[PDB]
DNA sequence: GCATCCGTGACAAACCTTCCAGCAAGGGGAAGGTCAAGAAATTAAT
DNA sequence: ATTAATTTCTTGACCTTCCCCTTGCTGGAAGGTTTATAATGGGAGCTGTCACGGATGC
C-alpha cells in the first residue's frame, strides 16, 4: 500500500467488517475467566483468548486452523484476530453520531442550512420535522413542535409525514436529493449578490461537491449500526492484585448495548411513545458519551467519580493515542540514566555502564556469543549473562566498538538535544557524556534522566555513525 | 449471587455497627449459614475493575494501562528458542537419511499442519503402529546419546 | 533503568515505564521531530515500528539479530491498526491502498 | 490452583536455591545478589499448548515441565544487600509451613522477651522507689536489702 | 468510612511523606499546597498565585 | 513391574485400581519412564489388603482408612477395633431398618393370588 | 492524518471523513504516523523509487 | 398446585422429584404454559407413594415398577408381589453376606491399643 | 456589518424452571503406548 | 563370483489413559416470576481555569 483513503462508514460496510455480531451485555464470566456465547469479549464474534486454544477446550494445538467449533462458534486461530474483529451492535433504532452533530462546525446543519439550536430541538425528542407535505405550509426542513404536530395531524391527516428524532433526520438526509440540490445551490450561489451569504453557501456547496465527488452519502453520516472496539484493545485483563483491570470504554459499550436491548424489549412489548422516545434519546446520549463525552452534556461518571474516556478522549491532546502512543511512544532498548563527565574521551565518544550495556545489548550479546562459538544456545548465554561471566565483558567490549548508540535528553530543546555516540565500557551505573556537547544539549549535570537508544540494523547503525554522530556537526 | 452478596454486605455493615472492628469472614459465614470458602469466593468478586484512566500517579500525565503485563508474552526465550530449536531440528533431522525423519516430523507436528498419531502416519507408509514405534525408539536411541545432539541437549532450559 | 524486551502491555502493545514496572524511557514527540530534523529515516522506522510497535515485527527483528542478520525488516505497525480499528468502530470508513 | 510457596523450582540451579529453606524463603541475614531468587513462589500454570519442537524435546530427554511455573519474584538486577526481616501473612483457614511458623515463633519470642525485660526494669525502678521510701522513713540495712525483692 | 478513606490516601492533598530526613517530615507537615478541591490546579494557574 | 499380572494376583482390573489411585487413599506409585504404574512388594501388600476388604470384608470408606493406617507403618489393632465397632453399629441399624421394611412388606403387601379379581387396593394402602 | 494529530482531532477528522480526503502521504509526519519510511533524509531516495513505481 | 410446595407439604425436596422427572419414574405432568408445573392429586398420591417406598428401603427400579402399575384400573398384585419377594430375597442375601463379614472379622482385634511398635498380627494374617 | 456566548489548547425477599459437576464403587469403549515370534541384510567356506 | 550365524525390521500380542457412562441422589450455577396497606417533581459537581476562534443576535 502507498496511500490512505478515508470515507464514511456504510452499514453494509460494517456488516462486511463484522464477522460476528454482539447482542448481549455480558463481557466475561465471573467465576471462570472465559466469555460465554454472544458477548462483548466472546470467542465466536472476536476470537479465542490464547494462541490456538478454543473456549471449551476441544480443539487446540494447531490441529484445527480454519474450522468453527459447533458448540460455541469459536474460530481457533491466534490472538491477532482479537485486534481486528469488529462489532455490529444490532440497533433497534437509528441514532445520532455526535461527532457529526455537536462539532465546531457541526457539519450536519451546514449541509442543510439549519441552526444548531434547531438540531438540538429535533435530535432530542422534543420537536418534530416534516420531510414533505401536500401543501406549501409544511415544506421541507420545517421545525414543528408537538402541538404544531397535533395541529398538522388534525388539519392534514395522511397528506404529511412528520416523524421525530434520528429516524426523521435520517430519512430527510437519505431522501432529499443527490445532485439536483447541488446544481440549484451552485446556480443560486452566483445568482444572488451578497457577501454574508457567499461565505457560507460556498462552504455548503464545497461540502456537497465533496460528498458527490468522494462517493459518500449523507445516510452514511448518521449512525444506524454501531461497531465496537476490538476487545484486545479494551482488555479486561486480571491484574496481579486480585481485582480486574477493565476499560471505561467497556462500561460505555455495555451501557449502549444495555439501552439497545431495552429498546428491543420496548419495541415488541407495545410501548407508548414517551418511553420509546426517551429510550431513543437515551441511546443517543449513550452513543454521544461513548463517542465524545464532553459535547452533548455532562460527562458520564463511573465508580471512582471521574469523567470516563470516550472515543474522542482516546484521541485528544497529549493524553490521546497520537501524542502518547503513536507519535511520542515508549521504545525498547532505551535506558534511563543520569549524566556524568567523561573528560578523557573523544568528541564522538561517550561513556556507558557495563551493567546497562549488558542488559541493553542482549540480542547483540547473544548473537556475538553464538557466532563466536563461546555459547551453545540462547538461554546458556542468558545464564552466562545472569551470572556475570568474565568473557561476556570481553565480548561486550568487542560488540560495543564500531557500534554507535543514540544519547537523548528528555525533553530535548532542539535538534542537538539528541545525537549519536560511540560508547566505551567503564564502571559505574551512569553515562559519561562528553563535555563539549552539553551546551548543544543545554543539559547541565543536574541528574538529568537521559535515554540511550540503540540502533539495531546496519542501516540505522551507519545512519547513527555517518550522519548524526557528534563528529558530523 | 447479587442478592447473596447484598445480604452479605448488609450483614457486614450490621457486624461493623455491632463490633466496630473490620468484619472477619468467619462471623459472616456463620451468620450467613454458608461455608466459609463460598463466602470468600463471593467476596473475591467484589466490584467493578479499576478503569484505565484513573490517576494512579501524582499527576495527570500517566494514567493506567502503562503498567499492565502482557498475557501473550514474547520473552527472549519465547522469541529466540521457538525458531532456533526449529532450525536445530531441521539441521539434525536432515542428517537422518531415511524415512524416520519423515515419520517423526508428522509424529509431533514439525513443518506440518495437523498433528498425527501412529495410525495416521501408518496409513501413509507403515500401517502397523509398532513399526513406527520401533523406528521412533531407534531415533530416540540415536538422539539421546550426548555425542552429536549436545546442541539439542543444551535446549532443555 | 533500562529495558530490553520484557513485560509488554495489552492495550496498544507498548513497552511500559518506570523501574518498578521495568519499562524504558518515553521517546517523546520532540525527540521524533529532532530525529526527523536530522533526516534519520531508518532509526525512526525502528523507533516507532519494529522496536516497540509490531509484535510480529519485533520478534522477527530479535530473531534476525540473534542469527546475525542486521537487516531492516519493517511491516504493519500494531498500534497504527489500533487507531484504524478505533476510528472504524467510531463510525468512519478507512482502508489502505 | 492456588499459588504454593515451595522450594523445588524447575529451570534453575541448586546454587540459586542454596540460600533457601524447604519453604523457599531466604534465611535472615542472607547476602543476596541482584538476579537471585529471594522467595520461591511458583504458580500452578494451565496446560498451555506447546510447540512441536519442545514436544520432541520432551519426548527425547527427561525434561518434563509440569504445571509448576517459574514465576517467583526475584531480586531486581543491580540491587545487592542483605535481608533484615521477612514478614509473613496468611488467610484464615490456611495452614502454615515451617518458615511462617518459625517467623511467628520469632515474633512471639520478641514480644515475650522485650515485654519481659520491660516489666523487669519497670519492677526494678518501682522497687528502687520503694527502697527510697523505706530509707526515707526509717533505716534497715538487713531487713530490707538482704531480704529478696519479691 | 468510604469518604474518610478516600480523603486519606487518594486525594490530591494526601501524598507520600518522605521519611528520609526529619527535615523532610517537618517541611511536608508545614507544607501549604493549593491543589485538590477548592484550590487551583498546576495547569490552570497563572503568575498571580 | 507393570500391573497386569499384579492385577490378576489382587483380583481386580486396571480401572478400579486407577480410580483408587485418583482418590486420596492410595500412595503414589512409581512410573517407569512410560506412564505405567509400578508396584513393589509393599505396594502389593497394600493392594492385597485393600482388595481383601473391599471385595471381601469391608467397603471403600473403611478399607481406605485401613490402607491409610497401613502405610504409617505403625499399625494399631484397637483403632481398627473401634472402627469396626462403629461399622457394625451402622450395619445393625441398617439391618434393623431392613427387617422393619420386611415386616412392613409382609404386613401391608398380602393380597389375593393370581385369578380374575384384579384392582387390588394394597398399593393404595401402601400409599397412605 | 497529520492534521488529525495537532489539535481538534474531532473537528478535522470529521472534515476528513465527510470529504473523502485520500492521503497520498507526501508529507514527512504522514509517514511517521503510518509507520513507514519518511520521505525525508535517507528515505527521500526510497520515496523517489516509491512514487515513480506507482 | 406446584411441585415444591407439595414437596414441602409431603416432606420431600424438589431435587428428588426433578430427578424422578428426568428419568422414567414419575408420569410427566402437563405444562402450565409458564415456568412452573401443575400437579394432579393423583400425581401427588403417586409422589407420596414413591416417597413411602423410598423411605423404607426399596430400590428405585422396583418402586418404579410399583408406580408404573399405579393410577390405573388394572392393578395386578401377583407378579409385582413375586418381584418384591425377589427384591427382599436379594436384600436378605445382602444381609447374609454383611453378617458373614461381621462374624468373620470380629475375633482378631483385642490387643495393641495404639503403641509405636511395628508389629500387628491382623494385616499379616489377612494379607 | 459589529458586540457577545461556547469548544479548546495548556513543556429486598422469596418463589419457581434448566444446566452441570461430585461421591459413591466402579465397568466399558475409543485412542494411543510397550514385549516375544518370524522375515530382510551381512559375512567366512570354496 | 557362492552362502551360513549374527544383526536388525516387521507383526501379533498385549498394556495404559480419556471420556462417557453406570443408579442414586446431592449440591451448585444460570435464568425467569411474584410479592398485593400505605408509598406520586430525584440528584450532583464546582467554580480559585485563562485566552483564542466560530457562530448569534442587534
Ligand atoms: Ag500394632
Ligand atoms: Mg535539567
Ligand atoms: Zn470451544
DSSP chain B: -HHHHHHHHHHHHHHHHHH-SPPPHHHHHHHTTS-HHHHHHHHHT-SPPBPTT---SSSSS--TTSSPPPSS---HHHHHHHHHHHHHHHHHTTS--SHHHHHHHHHHTTT-SS---HHHHIIIII-SHHHHHHHHHHHHHHHSSTTT-HHHHGGG-
Cα angle, residue A128 at apex, residues A125 and A129 outer, rounded to 5°? 130
Looking from the CA of H22 toward its CB, the CA atoms found within 13 Å total: 6
Which residues of H contribute to the annotated binding site?
112, 120
End-to-end CA distance of chain H: 59
The shortest CB-CB distance from A326 to any of G10, G11, G33 is to G33
- Strands annotated E in C1-97: 26-27, 92-96
Identify the three-state secondary structure at position C27: strand
The shortest CB-CB distance from B49 to any of A245, A313, A377 is to A245
Name the residue in chain B with its Cα closest to that of D55. Answer: B108
The helix (H) or strand (E) run that includes residue D43 is strand D43-44
Kindly write down the DSSP assignment for every residue of F90-125, as one continuous string: HHHHHHHHHHHHHHHHHHS-----SSS----THHHH
CA D114 – CA B11 distance, rounded (Å): 40
Q: Is the CB of B115 under 7 A from strand I?
A: no
> For residue A450, which ligand has an atom nearest its CA?
2
Q: Are A236 and B41 in contact (CB under 8 A)?
A: no
In the structure grid, which three cell numbers stand for residue H81, read together? 408381589
Surface-to-core class of residue A160, CB atoms within 10 Å of its CB (0-12 exposed, 13-18 middle, 19+ buried) = buried
Q: Are F47 and F14 in contact (CB under 8 A)?
A: no
Angle, helices H41-56 vs H60-68, to 10°: value is 150
Q: Are B1 and B46 in contact (CB under 8 A)?
A: no
Distances (CA, A) of B25 to A123, B11, B29, H81: 52, 11, 6, 56
Cβ-based contacts of B75 with chain C (< 8 Å): 5-6
Identify the three-state secondary structure at position H71: coil
Interface of C with A in 12-51 (CB under 8 A): 12, 14-17, 19, 23-32, 34-35, 37-43, 46-48, 50-51
For chain C, the domain total comes to 1
Secondary structure tally for chain E: helices H, strands E: 2, 0
Residue with cell 518459625: D102
Contacts of A357 by beta carbon, 8 Å cutoff, 6+ apart: A396, A400, A423, A425
End-to-end CA distance of chain G: 21
How many Å does it take to go from CA D70 to C1' J33?
Answer: 51
CA A270 – CA D10 distance, rounded (Å): 65
Whether C56 and chain B come into contact, CB under 8 Å, resolves to no
Which residues of H contribute to the annotated binding site for Cu(+)?
112, 120
Identify the three-state secondary structure at position D68: strand
Distance H109 CA to ligand 1 centre (A): 10
Q: Are G43 and G32 in contact (CB under 8 A)?
A: no
Neighbours of chain H (3+ CB pairs under 8 A): F
CATH of the domain at D15: 2.40.50.150
Closest among A361, A472, A459, A457 to A419, alpha carbons compared: A472
CA H29 – CA A368 distance, rounded (Å): 80
Give the number of other Cβ atoms within 10 Å of residue G28's Cβ: 20
* Backbone φ/ψ region at A77: left (φ over 0), alpha (ψ -120 to 50), beta: beta
The dihedral sign for the CA sequence F84, F89, F92, F98: negative
Give the number of other Cβ atoms within 10 Å of residue E40's Cβ: 14
Chains G and D touch (3+ CB pairs under 8 A): no
Give the number of other Cβ atoms within 10 Å of residue A40's Cβ: 24
CA distance A411 to chain B (A): 14
CA A152 – CA B30 distance, rounded (Å): 68
Q: Which structural technique was applied?
A: cryo-EM
Farthest-apart Cα atoms in chain G, separation: 35
Residue with cell 446556480: A187
Name the residue in chain B with its Cα closest to that of E14. Answer: B58
Interface of D with B in 28-57 (CB under 8 A): 51-57
Identify the three-state secondary structure at position E32: coil
Closest among D33, D30, D41 to D77, alpha carbons compared: D33
CA A441 – CA A421 distance, rounded (Å): 13
Interface of B with C in 63-122 (CB under 8 A): 65-76, 79-80, 83-84
Angle, helices D52-60 vs B99-108, to 10°: value is 110
CA distance G16 to chain A (A): 7
Surface-to-core class of residue A82, CB atoms within 10 Å of its CB (0-12 exposed, 13-18 middle, 19+ buried) = buried
Residue with cell 545478589: D33
CA A393 – CA A355 distance, rounded (Å): 10
CA B89 – CA B108 distance, rounded (Å): 12
Closest among A293, A290, A268, A265 to A279, alpha carbons compared: A265
CA H64 – CA H26 distance, rounded (Å): 8
Kindly write down the DSSP assignment for every residue of F36-91, as one continuous string: -EE--HHHHHHHHHHHHHHTTT--HHHHHHHHHHHTSS---TTHHHHHHHHHHHHH
Give the number of other Cβ atoms within 10 Å of residue A312's Cβ: 21
CA B149 – CA B147 distance, rounded (Å): 6
CA distance D42 to chain B (A): 17
Beta-strand relationship, C26-27 and A431-433: unpaired
CA distance G19 to chain A (A): 5
CA B34 – CA A340 distance, rounded (Å): 64
Within its chain, how far is the Cα of A164 from the centroid?
A: 32
CA A117 – CA A109 distance, rounded (Å): 10
Identify the three-state secondary structure at position H123: helix
Whether G7 and chain C come into contact, CB under 8 Å, resolves to no
Q: Which residues pair with A164 in a beta bridge?
A: none
Contacts of A172 by beta carbon, 8 Å cutoff, 6+ apart: A112, A129, A131, A140, A141
Identify the three-state secondary structure at position C78: coil
In the structure grid, which three cell numbers stand for residue D56, read together? 520432541
CA B22 – CA B7 distance, rounded (Å): 17
Give the number of other Cβ atoms within 10 Å of residue A110's Cβ: 18
Identify the three-state secondary structure at position F1: coil
Give the number of other Cβ atoms within 10 Å of residue F45's Cβ: 17
Q: Do C97 and A5 touch (CB under 8 A)?
A: yes
Rg (Cα) of chain H, in Å, rounded?
Answer: 23
Q: Map chain A to HEC letters.
A: CCCEEEEECCHHHHHHHHCCCCCCCCCCCCCCCCCCCCCCCCCCCCCCCECCECCCCCCECCCCCCCECCCCCCECCCHHHHHCCCCCECCCCCECCHHHCCCCCCCCCCCCCCCHHHHHHHHCCCCEEEEECCCCCCCCCEEECHHHHHHHHHHCCCCCEEECCHHHHHHHHHCCCCCHHHHHHHHHHHHCCCCCCCCCHHHHHHHHHHHHHCCCCCCCCCECCECCCCCCCCCCEECCCCCEECCHHHHHHHHHHHHHHHHHHHHHCCCCHHHHHHHHHHHHHHHHHHHCCCCCCCCCCCCCCCCCCCCCCCCCHHHCCHHHHHCCEECCCEEEECEEECCCCCCCEECCEHHHHHHHCHHHHHHHHHHHCCCCCHHHHHHHHHCCCHHHHHHHHHHHCCCCEEEEECCCCCHHHEEEEEECCECCCCEEECHHHHHHHCCCCCCCCEEEECCCCHHHHHHHHHCCECCCC
Q: Which residues of E touch chain B, with CB atoms under 8 Å apart?
A: 15, 42-43
CA G7 – CA A69 distance, rounded (Å): 46
Contacts of A304 by beta carbon, 8 Å cutoff, 6+ apart: B50, B51, B54
Residue with cell 522485650: D114
Q: Do B70 and C7 touch (CB under 8 A)?
A: yes
Beta-strand relationship, A431-433 and A339-341: parallel
Surface-to-core class of residue H69, CB atoms within 10 Å of its CB (0-12 exposed, 13-18 middle, 19+ buried) = middle
Q: Which nucleotides of I are covered by protein (CB under 7 A)?
A: 1, 7-18, 24-29, 31-36
Contacts of H31 by beta carbon, 8 Å cutoff, 6+ apart: H37
Range(s) of the domain holding residue D22: 1-94
Identify the three-state secondary structure at position D20: strand
Give the number of other Cβ atoms within 10 Å of residue B114's Cβ: 11
For chain F, the domain total comes to 1
Q: Do F123 and H73 touch (CB under 8 A)?
A: no
How many Å does it take to go from CA E42 to C1' J49?
Answer: 10
Range(s) of the domain holding residue F107: 1-128
Chains C and A touch (3+ CB pairs under 8 A): yes
In the structure grid, which three cell numbers stand for residue H36, read together? 412452573
Q: Are D96 and D5 in contact (CB under 8 A)?
A: no
CA F15 – CA F12 distance, rounded (Å): 8
Residue with cell 460528498: A211
Contacts of H48 by beta carbon, 8 Å cutoff, 6+ apart: F127, F128, H10
CA H52 – CA H11 distance, rounded (Å): 11
Cβ-based contacts of A7 with chain G (< 8 Å): 17, 20
Chains A and F touch (3+ CB pairs under 8 A): no
Amino acid at each position: 500500500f502507498d496511500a490512505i483513503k478515508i470515507a464514511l462508514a456504510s452499514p453494509d460496510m460494517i456488516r462486511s467488517w463484522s464477522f460476528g455480531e454482539v447482542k448481549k451485555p455480558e463481557t466475561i464470566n465471573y467465576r471462570t475467566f472465559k466469555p460465554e456465547r454472544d458477548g462483548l469479549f466472546c470467542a465466536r464474534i472476536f476470537g479465542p483468548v490464547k494462541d490456538y486454544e478454543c473456549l471449551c477446550g476441544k480443539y487446540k494445538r494447531l490441529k484445527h486452523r480454519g474450522v468453527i467449533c459447533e458448540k460455541c462458534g469459536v474460530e481457533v486461530t491466534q490472538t491477532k484476530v482479537r485486534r481486528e474483529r469488529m462489532g455490529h451492535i444490532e440497533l433497534a433504532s437509528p441514532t445520532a453520531h455526535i461527532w457529526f452533530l455537536k462539532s465546531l462546525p457541526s457539519r450536519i446543519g451546514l449541509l442543510l442550512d439549519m441552526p444548531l439550536r434547531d438540531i438540538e430541538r429535533v435530535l432530542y425528542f422534543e420537536s418534530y420535522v416534516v420531510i414533505e407535505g401536500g401543501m406549501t405550509n409544511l415544506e421541507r426542513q420545517q421545525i414543528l413542535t408537538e402541538e404544531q404536530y397535533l395541529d398538522a395531524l388534525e388539519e392534514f391527516g395522511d397528506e404529511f409525514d412528520a416523524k421525530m428524532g434520528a429516524e426523521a433526520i435520517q430519512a430527510l438526509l437519505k431522501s432529499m436529493d443527490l445532485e439536483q440540490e447541488c446544481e440549484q445551490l451552485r446556480e443560486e450561489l452566483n445568482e444572488t449578490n451578497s457577501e454574508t451569504k457567499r461565505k457560507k453557501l460556498t462552504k455548503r456547496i464545497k461540502l456537497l461537491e465533496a460528498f458527490v465527488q468522494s462517493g459518500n452519502k449523507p445516510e452514511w453520516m448518521i449512525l444506524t449500526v454501531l461497531p465496537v472496539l476490538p476487545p484486545d484493545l479494551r482488555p479486561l485483563v486480571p491484574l496481579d492484585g486480585g481485582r480486574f483491570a477493565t476499560s471505561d470504554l467497556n462500561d460505555l459499550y455495555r451501557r449502549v448495548i444495555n439501552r439497545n436491548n431495552r429498546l428491543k424489549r420496548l419495541l415488541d412489548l407495545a410501548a407508548p411513545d414517551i418511553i420509546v422516545r426517551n429510550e431513543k434519546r437515551m441511546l443517543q446520549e449513550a452513543v454521544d458519551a461513548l463517542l465524545d463525552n464532553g459535547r452533548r452534556g455532562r460527562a458520564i461518571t463511573g465508580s471512582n467519580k471521574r469523567p470516563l474516556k470516550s472515543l474522542a478522549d482516546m484521541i485528544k491532546g497529549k493524553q490521546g493515542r497520537f501524542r502518547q502512543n503513536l507519535l511520542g511512544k515508549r521504545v525498547d532498548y532505551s535506558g534511563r540514566s543520569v549524566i556524568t563527565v567523561g573528560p578523557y574521551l573523544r568528541l564522538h565518544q561517550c561513556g556507558l555502564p557495563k551493567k546497562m550495556a549488558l542488559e541493553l545489548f542482549k540480542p547483540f550479546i547473544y548473537g556475538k556469543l553464538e557466532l563466536r562459538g563461546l555459547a551453545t544456545t540462547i538461554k546458556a548465554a542468558k545464564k552466562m549473562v545472569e551470572r556475570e561471566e568474565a568473557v561476556v565483558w570481553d565480548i561486550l567490549d568487542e560488540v560495543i566498538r564500531e557500534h554507535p548508540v543514540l544519547l537523548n535528553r528528555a525533553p530535548t530543546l532542539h535538534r542537538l538535544g539528541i545525537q549519536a555516540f560511540e560508547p566505551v565500557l567503564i564502571e559505574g551505573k551512569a553515562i559519561q557524556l562528553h563535555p563539549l556537547v552539553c551546551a548543544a544539549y543545554n543539559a547541565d549535570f543536574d541528574g538529568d534522566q537521559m535515554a540511550v537508544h540503540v540502533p539495531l540494523t546496519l542501516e540505522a547503525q551507519l545512519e547513527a555513525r555517518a550522519l548524526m554522530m557528534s563528529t558530523n556537526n | 449471587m447479587i442478592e447473596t452478596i447484598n445480604k452479605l454486605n448488609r450483614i457486614s455493615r450490621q457486624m461493623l455497627q455491632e463490633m466496630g472492628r473490620e468484619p472477619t469472614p468467619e462471623e459472616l459465614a456463620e451468620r450467613m449459614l454458608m461455608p466459609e470458602d463460598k463466602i470468600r469466593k463471593v467476596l473475591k468478586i467484589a466490584k467493578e475493575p479499576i478503569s484505565m484512566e484513573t490517576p494512579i500517579g501524582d499527576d495527570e500525565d500517566s494514567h493506567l494501562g502503562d503498567f499492565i503485563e502482557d498475557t501473550t508474552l514474547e520473552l527472549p526465550l519465547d522469541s529466540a528458542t521457538t525458531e532456533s530449536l526449529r532450525a536445530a531440528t531441521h539441521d539434525v533431522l536432515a542428517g537422518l537419511t531415511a524415512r524416520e525423519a519423515k515419520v517423526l516430523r508428522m509424529r509431533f507436528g514439525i513443518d506440518m499442519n495437523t498433528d498425527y498419531t501412529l495410525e495416521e502416519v501408518g496409513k501413509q507408509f507403515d500401517v502397523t503402529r509398532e513399526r513406527i514405534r520401533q523406528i521412533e525408539a531407534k531415533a530416540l536411541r540415536k538422539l539421546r546419546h550426548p555425542s552429536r545432539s549436545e546442541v539439542l541437549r543444551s535446549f532443555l532450559d | 533503568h533500562a529495558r530490553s524486551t520484557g513485560s509488554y502491555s495489552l492495550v496498544t502493545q507498548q513497552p511500559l515505564g518506570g523501574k518498578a514496572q521495568f519499562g524504558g524511557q518515553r521517546f517523546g514527540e520532540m525527540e521524533v521531530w529532532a530525529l526527523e530534523a536530522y533526516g534519520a529515516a531508518y532509526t525512526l522506522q525502528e523507533m516507532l515500528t519494529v522496536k516497540s510497535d509490531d509484535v510480529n515485527g519485533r520478534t522477527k527483528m530479535y530473531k534476525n539479530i540473534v542469527d546475525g542478520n542486521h537487516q531492516m525488516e519493517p511491516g504493519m505497525p500494531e498500534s497504527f491498526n489500533v487507531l484504524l480499528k478505533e476510528i472504524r468502530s467510531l463510525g468512519i470508513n478507512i482502508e489502505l491502498e | 490452583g492456588p499459588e504454593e510457596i515451595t522450594a523445588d523450582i524447575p529451570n534453575v540451579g541448586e546454587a540459586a536455591l542454596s540460600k533457601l529453606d524447604e519453604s523457599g524463603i531466604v534465611y535472615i541475614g542472607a547476602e543476596v545478589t541482584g538476579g537471585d531468587i529471594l522467595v520461591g513462589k511458583v504458580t500452578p500454570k494451565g496446560e498451555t499448548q506447546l510447540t512441536p519442537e519442545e514436544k520432541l524435546l520432551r519426548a527425547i530427554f527427561g525434561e518434563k515441565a509440569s504445571d509448576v511455573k517459574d514465576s517467583s519474584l526475584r531480586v531486581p538486577n543491580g540491587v545487592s544487600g542483605t535481608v533484615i526481616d521477612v514478614q509473613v501473612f496468611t488467610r484464615d483457614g490456611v495452614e502454615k509451613d515451617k518458615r511462617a511458623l518459625e517467623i511467628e515463633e520469632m515474633q512471639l519470642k520478641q514480644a515475650k522477651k522485650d515485654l519481659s525485660e520491660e516489666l523487669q526494669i519497670l519492677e526494678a525502678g518501682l522497687f528502687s522507689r520503694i527502697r527510697a521510701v523505706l530509707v526515707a522513713g526509717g533505716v534497715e540495712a538487713e531487713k530490707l536489702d538482704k531480704l529478696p525483692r519479691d | 468510612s468510604a469518604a474518610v478513606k478516600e480523603f486519606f490516601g487518594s486525594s490530591q492533598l494526601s501524598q507520600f511523606m518522605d521519611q528520609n530526613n526529619p527535615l523532610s517530615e517537618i517541611t511536608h507537615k508545614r507544607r501549604i499546597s493549593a491543589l485538590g478541591p477548592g484550590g487551583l490546579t498546576r495547569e490552570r494557574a497563572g503568575f498571580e498565585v | 513391574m507393570n500391573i497386569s499380572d499384579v492385577a490378576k494376583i489382587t483380583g481386580l482390573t486396571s480401572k478400579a485400581i486407577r480410580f483408587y489411585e485418583e482418590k486420596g487413599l492410595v500412595t503414589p506409585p512409581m512410573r517407569s519412564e512410560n506412564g505405567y504404574r509400578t508396584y513393589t512388594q509393599q505396594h502389593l501388600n497394600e493392594l492385597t489388603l485393600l482388595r481383601q476388604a473391599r471385595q471381601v470384608g469391608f467397603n471403600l470408606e473403611e478399607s481406605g482408612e485401613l490402607v491409610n493406617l497401613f502405610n504409617d507403618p505403625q499399625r494399631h489393632s484397637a483403632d481398627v477395633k473401634r472402627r469396626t465397632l462403629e461399622k457394625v453399629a451402622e450395619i445393625e441399624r441398617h439391618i434393623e431398618e431392613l427387617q422393619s421394611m420386611r415386616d412392613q412388606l409382609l404386613a401391608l403387601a398380602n393380597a389375593c393370588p393370581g385369578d380374575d379379581s384384579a384392582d387390588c387396593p394394597i398399593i393404595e394402602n401402601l400409599s397412605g | 492524518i497529520s492534521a488529525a494529530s495537532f489539535q481538534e482531532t474531532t473537528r478535522v477528522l470529521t472534515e476528513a471523513a465527510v470529504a473523502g480526503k485520500r492521503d497520498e502521504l507526501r508529507g514527512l509526519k504522514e509517514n511517521v504516523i503510518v509507520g513507514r519510511l519518511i520521505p525525508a533524509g535517507t528515505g527521500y531516495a526510497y520515496h523517489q523509487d516509491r512514487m515513480r513505481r506507482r
